[PDB]
Each structure stands twice: as structure tokens, then as C-alpha cells.
Ligand binder design. Structure first.
Ligand code: HEC
Ligand SMILES: [Cl-]
Ligand SMILES: [Cl-]
Ligand SMILES: [Cl-]
Ligand SMILES: [Cl-]
Ligand code: NA
Ligand code: NA
Ligand code: NA
Ligand code: NA
Length: 82
């Protein structure tokens, strides 16, 4: 799975198993993702592309296709509770 591979290589440092070791209240599990509206590929992809706060932008680091793939992976994992 490309999305999983991208996640392992670029996201798992902070978000292993859907957590967030940096910002406790902003993890990738169902509750926080739903509360914050990260419930579509597009919502997730927008964040990954642009960054926010202490999370880097990935729009000049990952391709559009890679961003879509990792965003779909995160969506599916979050909706099903990692
Ligand atoms: C640590 C250096 C991080 C890496 C690597 C990635 N993310 Fe991240 N993410 C981080 C922080 C500090 C935050 C909070 C941003 C804020 O201030 O609100 C986030 C948030 C997310 C979210 C939203 C989670 C939520 O609101 O509950 C998503 C969907 C997310 N991060 C995805 C994501 C992906 C796919 C990454 C790899 C490309 C990635 N993050 C890397 C910190 C860090
Ligand atoms: Cl794939
Ligand atoms: Cl990768
Ligand atoms: Cl933070
Ligand atoms: Cl950045
Ligand atoms: Na890997
Ligand atoms: Na913290
Ligand atoms: Na670049
Ligand atoms: Na940069």
C-alpha cells in the first residue's frame, strides 16, 4: 500500500499508530479527526499540503499523488480506529 508506505516514511515520526506525540489533542483517531472535520480525503490532503502550526507543509515535499494516497490511508485508518 503506497499510502501506508508514505505514512511510514513521512508521518509516523509524530503519528505512529494514529497518535500525535507533539499535540496530544490533535491525533489521527476517530474522535479528534471527527471533531476537527478531517473526515474526507480533501480535508486531510489540504492540511498535509499546507501544514499547520508545528506540522510542516508537505506540498513541496510529496507529490500531489502521494498526498492523495497518504490522505486516503489516514482517512480509512481514522474511520476504523487504527
Ligand atoms: C511531527 C513533526 C508531525 C509530522 C511528521 C506530521 N504531523 Fe500531522 N500533525 C502534527 C501536529 C503538531 C498537528 C497539529 C496541528 C495543529 O496545530 O492543529 C498535526 C495534525 C495532523 C492532522 C489533524 C489531526 C486532528 O486534527 O485531530 C492530520 C490529519 C495530520 N496531522 C496528518 C499528517 C500526515 C498525513 C503526515 C505525513 C505526511 C503528518 N501529519 C506528519 C505533527 C506532525
Ligand atoms: Cl498502492
Ligand atoms: Cl514514501
Ligand atoms: Cl503543537
Ligand atoms: Cl513548513
Ligand atoms: Na515502509
Ligand atoms: Na505535547
Ligand atoms: Na521540493
Ligand atoms: Na520549506
Amino acid at each position: 500500500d503506497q499510502g501506508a508506505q508514505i505514512f511510514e516514511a513521512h508521518c509516523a515520526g509524530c503519528h505512529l499508530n494514529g497518535g500525535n506525540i507533539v499535540r496530544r489533542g490533535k491525533n489521527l483517531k476517530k474522535r479528534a479527526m471527527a471533531k476537527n472535520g478531517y473526515t474526507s480525503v480533501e480535508a486531510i490532503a489540504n492540511l498535509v499540503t499546507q501544514g499547520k502550526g508545528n506540522m510542516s507543509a508537505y506540498g513541496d515535499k510529496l507529490s500531489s499523488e502521494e498526498i492523495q494516497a497518504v490522505s486516503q490511508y489516514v482517512l480509512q485508518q481514522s474511520q476504523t480506529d487504527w
